[PDB]
Protein backbone atom coordinates (compact mmCIF):
# COMPACT_ATOMS: atom_id res chain seq x y z
CA UNK A 1 0.00 0.00 0.00
CA UNK A 2 0.99 3.65 -0.48
CA UNK A 3 2.48 5.31 2.62
CA UNK A 4 2.53 9.10 2.32
CA UNK A 5 3.04 12.02 4.67
CA UNK A 6 -0.04 13.29 6.50
CA UNK A 7 -1.93 16.44 5.52
CA UNK A 8 -3.99 18.72 7.75
CA UNK A 9 -7.04 17.40 5.88
CA UNK A 10 -6.06 13.91 7.11
CA UNK A 11 -6.33 14.86 10.80
CA UNK A 12 -10.08 14.16 11.23
CA UNK A 13 -9.49 10.66 9.83
CA UNK A 14 -6.34 10.18 11.92
CA UNK A 15 -8.29 11.19 15.00
CA UNK A 16 -10.88 8.50 14.32
CA UNK A 17 -8.18 5.81 14.13
CA UNK A 18 -6.66 6.87 17.46
CA UNK A 19 -10.06 7.09 19.15
CA UNK A 20 -10.83 3.59 17.85
CA UNK A 21 -7.90 2.23 19.90
CA UNK A 22 -8.80 4.50 22.84
CA UNK A 23 -6.36 4.75 25.78
CA UNK A 24 -5.66 1.22 26.99
CA UNK A 25 -3.80 0.38 23.77
CA UNK A 26 -2.83 3.68 22.13
CA UNK A 27 -1.98 6.88 23.96
CA UNK A 28 -4.88 9.26 23.38
CA UNK A 29 -4.19 12.37 21.29
CA UNK A 30 -6.67 15.24 21.18
CA UNK A 31 -7.55 17.10 18.02
CA UNK A 32 -5.21 20.08 18.42
CA UNK A 33 -2.12 18.05 19.32
CA UNK A 34 -2.61 16.04 16.11
CA UNK A 35 -2.63 19.22 14.03
CA UNK A 36 0.64 20.19 15.73
CA UNK A 37 2.21 16.75 15.17
CA UNK A 38 1.08 16.53 11.53
CA UNK A 39 4.66 17.13 10.31
CA UNK A 40 5.87 13.79 11.74
CA UNK A 41 2.76 11.73 10.86
CA UNK A 42 2.20 9.27 8.02
CA UNK A 43 -0.96 7.65 6.65
CA UNK A 44 -1.76 4.61 4.51
CA UNK A 45 -4.34 5.10 1.76
CA UNK A 46 -6.83 2.40 0.81
CA UNK A 47 -5.30 0.25 -2.01
CA UNK A 48 -8.26 1.02 -4.30
CA UNK A 49 -10.03 4.17 -3.09
CA UNK A 50 -7.94 7.28 -3.67
CA UNK A 51 -9.07 9.50 -0.81
CA UNK A 52 -9.86 7.32 2.19
CA UNK A 53 -7.11 6.56 4.71
CA UNK A 54 -7.11 3.30 6.67
CA UNK A 55 -3.96 3.65 8.78
CA UNK A 56 -1.78 6.24 10.47
CA UNK A 57 1.57 6.33 12.21
CA UNK A 58 4.21 8.68 13.51
CA UNK A 59 7.92 8.69 14.30
CA UNK A 60 8.77 10.74 17.38
CA UNK A 61 12.33 11.85 18.04
CA UNK A 62 13.46 11.47 21.65
CA UNK A 63 17.15 12.45 21.53
CA UNK A 64 20.22 12.79 19.30
CA UNK A 65 20.29 9.05 18.55
CA UNK A 66 16.88 7.81 19.73
CA UNK A 67 13.48 7.75 18.04
CA UNK A 68 10.11 6.24 18.85
CA UNK A 69 7.25 4.72 16.87
CA UNK A 70 3.93 5.86 18.30
CA UNK A 71 0.24 6.17 17.45
CA UNK A 72 0.15 3.29 14.97
CA UNK A 73 -3.48 2.48 14.16
CA UNK A 74 -5.21 0.55 11.39
CA UNK A 75 -8.92 0.20 10.74
CA UNK A 76 -10.11 -2.86 12.72
CA UNK A 77 -11.59 -4.25 9.48
CA UNK A 78 -8.34 -3.79 7.51
CA UNK A 79 -5.81 -5.49 9.78
CA UNK A 80 -3.89 -8.47 8.45
CA UNK A 81 -3.48 -6.95 4.97
CA UNK A 82 0.07 -5.71 5.55
CA UNK A 83 -0.96 -2.08 6.11
CA UNK A 84 0.46 -1.74 9.62
CA UNK A 85 3.72 -3.27 8.40
CA UNK A 86 3.85 -0.91 5.41
CA UNK A 87 3.56 2.04 7.81
CA UNK A 88 6.34 0.80 10.09
CA UNK A 89 8.60 0.10 7.11
CA UNK A 90 8.37 3.75 6.04
CA UNK A 91 8.50 5.19 9.57
CA UNK A 92 11.75 3.28 10.06
CA UNK A 93 13.10 4.63 6.77
CA UNK A 94 12.54 8.21 7.94
CA UNK A 95 14.30 7.23 11.17
CA UNK A 96 17.26 6.40 8.93
CA UNK A 97 16.87 9.69 7.06
CA UNK A 98 17.07 11.31 10.51
CA UNK A 99 20.38 9.49 11.18
CA UNK A 100 18.89 7.69 14.18
CA UNK A 101 20.50 4.60 15.71
CA UNK A 102 17.82 3.14 18.01
CA UNK A 103 14.03 3.01 17.67
CA UNK A 104 11.82 2.42 20.72
CA UNK A 105 8.30 1.00 20.99
CA UNK A 106 5.99 0.46 23.97
CA UNK A 107 3.20 -1.88 22.91
CA UNK A 108 1.29 -5.09 23.47
CA UNK A 109 1.90 -6.12 19.83
CA UNK A 110 5.13 -8.00 20.50
CA UNK A 111 4.71 -10.38 17.56
CA UNK A 112 3.85 -7.56 15.14
CA UNK A 113 6.96 -5.43 15.69
CA UNK A 114 9.20 -8.49 16.10
CA UNK A 115 9.09 -9.05 12.32
CA UNK A 116 11.05 -5.78 11.86
CA UNK A 117 13.93 -6.80 14.13
CA UNK A 118 12.50 -5.39 17.35
CA UNK A 119 13.56 -7.31 20.45
CA UNK A 120 11.87 -7.02 23.83
CA UNK A 121 13.91 -5.25 26.52
CA UNK A 122 13.77 -4.03 30.12
CA UNK A 123 14.36 -0.53 31.46
CA UNK A 124 15.16 2.76 29.77
CA UNK A 125 18.36 2.60 27.66
CA UNK A 126 19.74 6.10 28.20
CA UNK A 127 22.42 7.67 30.38
CA UNK A 128 21.21 9.19 33.64
CA UNK A 129 22.46 12.55 32.37
CA UNK A 130 20.26 12.11 29.30
CA UNK A 131 17.45 10.72 31.47
CA UNK A 132 17.59 13.94 33.48
CA UNK A 133 17.24 16.09 30.36
CA UNK A 134 14.20 14.10 29.19
CA UNK A 135 12.41 14.40 32.54
CA UNK A 136 11.96 18.04 31.45
CA UNK A 137 9.58 17.08 28.62
CA UNK A 138 5.92 18.05 28.43
CA UNK A 139 5.21 15.00 26.24
CA UNK A 140 3.47 12.05 27.88
CA UNK A 141 4.87 9.51 25.42
CA UNK A 142 8.34 10.45 26.64
CA UNK A 143 7.29 9.82 30.25
CA UNK A 144 6.00 6.37 29.28
CA UNK A 145 9.40 5.70 27.73
CA UNK A 146 11.10 6.87 30.93
CA UNK A 147 8.68 4.79 33.04
CA UNK A 148 8.05 7.84 35.20
CA UNK A 149 5.96 7.20 38.28
CA UNK A 150 2.87 9.21 37.30
CA UNK A 151 2.33 7.29 34.03
CA UNK A 152 3.16 3.80 35.38
CA UNK A 153 -0.50 2.80 35.99
CA UNK A 154 -1.29 3.55 32.33
CA UNK A 155 1.30 1.22 30.77
CA UNK A 156 1.50 -1.94 32.87
CA UNK A 157 1.29 -5.02 30.65
CA UNK A 158 2.91 -3.24 27.72
CA UNK A 159 6.22 -4.62 26.47
CA UNK A 160 9.26 -2.45 25.79
CA UNK A 161 10.89 -3.31 22.47
CA UNK A 162 13.82 -1.74 20.68
CA UNK A 163 15.42 -1.83 17.24
CA UNK A 164 18.99 -1.08 16.16
CA UNK A 165 19.89 0.15 12.70
CA UNK A 166 22.70 -0.81 10.31
CA UNK B 1 26.16 39.59 0.32
CA UNK B 2 25.02 35.96 0.10
CA UNK B 3 21.66 34.29 0.60
CA UNK B 4 22.31 31.34 2.94
CA UNK B 5 21.11 27.78 2.59
CA UNK B 6 18.01 27.18 4.72
CA UNK B 7 17.56 23.44 5.25
CA UNK B 8 15.68 21.12 7.57
CA UNK B 9 17.25 20.62 10.97
CA UNK B 10 19.17 17.49 11.92
CA UNK B 11 19.51 16.04 15.41
CA UNK B 12 23.16 17.11 15.32
CA UNK B 13 21.92 20.70 14.87
CA UNK B 14 19.88 20.71 18.10
CA UNK B 15 22.76 21.76 20.41
CA UNK B 16 23.40 24.75 18.12
CA UNK B 17 19.68 25.57 18.00
CA UNK B 18 19.69 25.41 21.80
CA UNK B 19 22.28 28.19 22.04
CA UNK B 20 20.31 30.39 19.64
CA UNK B 21 17.08 30.03 21.62
CA UNK B 22 18.95 30.49 24.91
CA UNK B 23 20.53 33.64 23.46
CA UNK B 24 17.12 35.33 23.22
CA UNK B 25 16.10 33.88 26.58
CA UNK B 26 12.52 34.62 27.73
CA UNK B 27 12.28 38.35 27.11
CA UNK B 28 12.02 37.80 23.34
CA UNK B 29 11.70 34.08 22.59
CA UNK B 30 9.81 31.40 24.47
CA UNK B 31 12.49 29.21 26.03
CA UNK B 32 12.80 25.64 24.73
CA UNK B 33 14.75 22.96 26.59
CA UNK B 34 16.87 20.30 24.92
CA UNK B 35 14.32 17.49 24.74
CA UNK B 36 11.51 19.60 23.25
CA UNK B 37 13.99 20.67 20.56
CA UNK B 38 14.80 17.05 19.71
CA UNK B 39 11.06 16.33 19.58
CA UNK B 40 10.39 19.36 17.36
CA UNK B 41 13.37 18.70 15.08
CA UNK B 42 11.02 17.55 12.30
CA UNK B 43 9.40 21.00 12.04
CA UNK B 44 12.55 23.07 12.61
CA UNK B 45 14.70 24.77 9.98
CA UNK B 46 18.20 26.23 10.11
CA UNK B 47 20.28 28.61 8.03
CA UNK B 48 23.80 27.37 7.41
CA UNK B 49 26.69 29.66 8.21
CA UNK B 50 28.06 31.16 4.96
CA UNK B 51 31.60 30.10 6.00
CA UNK B 52 31.53 27.24 8.53
CA UNK B 53 30.14 24.03 7.04
CA UNK B 54 28.47 22.47 10.08
CA UNK B 55 27.58 25.32 12.41
CA UNK B 56 24.25 27.09 11.96
CA UNK B 57 23.75 30.83 12.43
CA UNK B 58 19.95 30.95 12.37
CA UNK B 59 16.96 28.80 13.18
CA UNK B 60 13.20 28.90 12.78
CA UNK B 61 10.19 26.65 12.95
CA UNK B 62 6.67 26.47 11.54
CA UNK B 63 4.13 25.05 13.98
CA UNK B 64 0.70 24.00 12.71
CA UNK B 65 -2.18 25.06 14.95
CA UNK B 66 -5.26 23.83 13.05
CA UNK B 67 -6.54 22.71 9.64
CA UNK B 68 -5.71 26.06 8.04
CA UNK B 69 -3.68 27.89 10.70
CA UNK B 70 0.06 27.89 11.28
CA UNK B 71 2.52 29.85 13.38
CA UNK B 72 6.14 30.86 12.95
CA UNK B 73 8.02 30.32 16.19
CA UNK B 74 11.52 30.25 17.71
CA UNK B 75 13.22 32.16 14.90
CA UNK B 76 16.70 33.19 16.03
CA UNK B 77 19.88 34.31 14.28
CA UNK B 78 23.35 34.80 15.73
CA UNK B 79 23.71 38.43 16.94
CA UNK B 80 26.99 38.69 15.00
CA UNK B 81 25.21 37.69 11.76
CA UNK B 82 22.13 39.91 12.09
CA UNK B 83 21.24 42.36 9.35
CA UNK B 84 22.72 40.11 6.65
CA UNK B 85 19.40 38.76 5.31
CA UNK B 86 19.44 35.41 7.14
CA UNK B 87 16.22 35.83 9.14
CA UNK B 88 14.28 36.74 6.01
CA UNK B 89 15.74 33.75 4.19
CA UNK B 90 14.42 31.60 7.05
CA UNK B 91 10.96 33.20 7.05
CA UNK B 92 10.77 32.91 3.25
CA UNK B 93 11.38 29.18 3.70
CA UNK B 94 9.01 28.71 6.65
CA UNK B 95 6.24 30.35 4.61
CA UNK B 96 6.95 28.02 1.68
CA UNK B 97 6.38 24.97 3.88
CA UNK B 98 3.16 26.57 5.14
CA UNK B 99 1.98 26.55 1.52
CA UNK B 100 3.08 22.95 0.94
CA UNK B 101 0.93 22.13 3.98
CA UNK B 102 -1.99 23.90 2.24
CA UNK B 103 -2.35 26.40 5.08
CA UNK B 104 -4.22 29.66 4.57
CA UNK B 105 -3.22 31.87 7.52
CA UNK B 106 0.08 32.20 9.40
CA UNK B 107 0.25 33.71 12.89
CA UNK B 108 3.16 35.47 14.59
CA UNK B 109 3.62 36.84 18.12
CA UNK B 110 6.63 39.16 18.13
CA UNK B 111 8.09 42.60 18.71
CA UNK B 112 9.61 42.57 15.19
CA UNK B 113 6.63 44.21 13.52
CA UNK B 114 8.57 45.70 10.59
CA UNK B 115 10.59 42.51 10.07
CA UNK B 116 7.55 40.34 9.35
CA UNK B 117 5.80 43.26 7.65
CA UNK B 118 8.22 42.82 4.74
CA UNK B 119 6.42 39.51 4.09
CA UNK B 120 2.89 40.95 4.12
CA UNK B 121 2.08 40.43 7.80
CA UNK B 122 -0.50 42.84 9.23
CA UNK B 123 -1.10 43.48 12.92
CA UNK B 124 -4.25 42.10 14.56
CA UNK B 125 -6.03 41.96 17.91
CA UNK B 126 -7.35 38.90 19.70
CA UNK B 127 -7.38 35.22 18.80
CA UNK B 128 -8.65 34.60 15.22
CA UNK B 129 -10.39 31.25 15.68
CA UNK B 130 -13.95 30.11 16.25
CA UNK B 131 -14.95 29.68 19.88
CA UNK B 132 -15.58 26.01 19.06
CA UNK B 133 -11.97 25.70 17.85
CA UNK B 134 -10.73 27.81 20.77
CA UNK B 135 -12.19 25.18 23.11
CA UNK B 136 -10.46 22.37 21.21
CA UNK B 137 -7.17 24.30 21.26
CA UNK B 138 -7.29 24.96 25.02
CA UNK B 139 -6.42 21.27 25.50
CA UNK B 140 -2.84 21.68 24.22
CA UNK B 141 0.25 21.13 26.36
CA UNK B 142 2.21 23.63 24.24
CA UNK B 143 2.88 27.03 25.80
CA UNK B 144 3.14 28.78 22.44
CA UNK B 145 -0.45 27.77 21.74
CA UNK B 146 -1.54 29.29 25.05
CA UNK B 147 0.08 32.58 24.04
CA UNK B 148 -1.86 32.45 20.77
CA UNK B 149 -5.05 31.88 22.79
CA UNK B 150 -4.18 34.86 25.03
CA UNK B 151 -4.61 32.71 28.13
CA UNK B 152 -4.35 34.53 31.44
CA UNK B 153 -1.37 32.73 32.98
CA UNK B 154 0.98 33.63 30.09
CA UNK B 155 -0.15 37.27 29.70
CA UNK B 156 2.67 38.69 31.89
CA UNK B 157 5.19 36.74 29.78
CA UNK B 158 4.10 38.37 26.50
CA UNK B 159 3.18 41.93 27.47
CA UNK B 160 4.26 44.37 24.77
CA UNK B 161 4.27 41.78 21.98
CA UNK B 162 2.21 42.39 18.84
CA UNK B 163 -0.06 39.81 17.20
CA UNK B 164 0.45 39.66 13.43
CA UNK B 165 -1.08 37.48 10.72
CA UNK B 166 -0.55 36.64 7.05
CA UNK B 167 -3.09 35.31 4.53
CA UNK B 168 -2.25 33.03 1.61
C1 LIG C 1 9.57 33.42 17.20
C2 LIG C 1 8.65 34.46 16.55
O1 LIG C 1 7.68 34.15 15.94
S1 LIG C 1 9.17 36.20 16.71
C3 LIG C 1 10.56 36.33 15.52
C4 LIG C 1 11.44 37.50 15.96
N1 LIG C 1 12.57 36.94 16.76
C5 LIG C 1 13.54 37.90 17.32
O2 LIG C 1 13.39 39.04 17.13
C6 LIG C 1 14.76 37.40 18.15
C7 LIG C 1 15.63 38.68 18.30
N2 LIG C 1 15.87 39.18 16.92
C8 LIG C 1 16.62 38.35 15.98
O3 LIG C 1 17.06 37.30 16.32
C9 LIG C 1 16.85 38.86 14.56
O4 LIG C 1 16.46 40.18 14.49
C10 LIG C 1 16.03 38.03 13.51
C11 LIG C 1 16.57 36.60 13.40
C12 LIG C 1 14.53 38.01 13.84
C13 LIG C 1 16.27 38.72 12.14
O5 LIG C 1 17.70 38.86 12.00
P1 LIG C 1 18.37 38.97 10.44
O6 LIG C 1 17.63 38.10 9.48
O7 LIG C 1 19.84 38.57 10.44
O8 LIG C 1 18.21 40.54 9.92
P2 LIG C 1 18.02 40.77 8.30
O9 LIG C 1 19.36 40.57 7.67
O10 LIG C 1 17.05 39.77 7.78
O11 LIG C 1 17.49 42.31 7.98
C14 LIG C 1 16.97 43.08 9.02
C15 LIG C 1 16.59 44.41 8.43
O12 LIG C 1 17.63 44.93 7.81
C16 LIG C 1 17.33 44.88 6.26
N3 LIG C 1 18.27 44.28 5.55
C17 LIG C 1 19.27 45.12 5.88
N4 LIG C 1 20.37 44.70 5.25
C18 LIG C 1 20.06 43.61 4.52
C19 LIG C 1 20.79 42.78 3.69
N5 LIG C 1 22.20 42.79 3.29
N6 LIG C 1 20.21 41.75 3.09
C20 LIG C 1 18.89 41.50 3.29
N7 LIG C 1 18.17 42.30 4.10
C21 LIG C 1 18.76 43.36 4.71
C22 LIG C 1 16.07 43.99 6.14
O13 LIG C 1 15.26 44.42 4.99
C23 LIG C 1 15.43 44.15 7.31
O14 LIG C 1 14.51 45.26 7.24
P3 LIG C 1 12.99 45.01 7.81
O15 LIG C 1 13.07 44.70 9.29
O16 LIG C 1 12.16 46.26 7.60
O17 LIG C 1 12.36 43.86 7.09
N1 LIG D 1 -1.32 5.40 27.50
C1 LIG D 1 -1.11 4.18 27.04
N2 LIG D 1 -2.11 3.30 27.02
N3 LIG D 1 0.09 3.84 26.58
C2 LIG D 1 0.44 2.52 26.05
C3 LIG D 1 1.55 2.60 25.02
C4 LIG D 1 1.19 3.60 23.94
C5 LIG D 1 2.12 3.57 22.73
N4 LIG D 1 3.46 4.01 23.09
C6 LIG D 1 1.54 4.44 21.61
O1 LIG D 1 2.17 4.62 20.57
O2 LIG D 1 0.44 4.98 21.73
N1 LIG E 1 8.77 34.89 25.94
C1 LIG E 1 7.68 34.80 25.19
N2 LIG E 1 6.86 33.78 25.35
N3 LIG E 1 7.42 35.75 24.29
C2 LIG E 1 6.26 35.79 23.40
C3 LIG E 1 6.62 35.53 21.94
C4 LIG E 1 7.11 34.11 21.72
C5 LIG E 1 7.69 33.88 20.32
N4 LIG E 1 6.64 34.00 19.31
C6 LIG E 1 8.36 32.51 20.23
O1 LIG E 1 8.00 31.69 19.38
O2 LIG E 1 9.27 32.20 20.99
Curated annotation (Swiss-Prot), chain A:
This is Amino-acid acetyltransferase. Was identified as a high-confidence drug target. Keywords: Acyltransferase, Amino-acid biosynthesis, Arginine biosynthesis, Transferase. It comes from Mycobacterium tuberculosis (strain ATCC 25618 / H37Rv). It comes from the Bacteria. GO terms for cellular component: cytoplasm. Disulfide bonds: none annotated. Pathway: Amino-acid biosynthesis; L-arginine biosynthesis; N(2)-acetyl-L-ornithine from L-glutamate: step 1/4. Inhibited by L-arginine. The keyword Protease does not apply.
Amino acid sequence: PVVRRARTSDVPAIKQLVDTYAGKILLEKNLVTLYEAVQEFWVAEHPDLYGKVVGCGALHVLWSDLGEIRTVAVDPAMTGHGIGHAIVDRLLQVARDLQLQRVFVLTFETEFFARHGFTEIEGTPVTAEVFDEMCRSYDIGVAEFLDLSYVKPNILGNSRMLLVLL
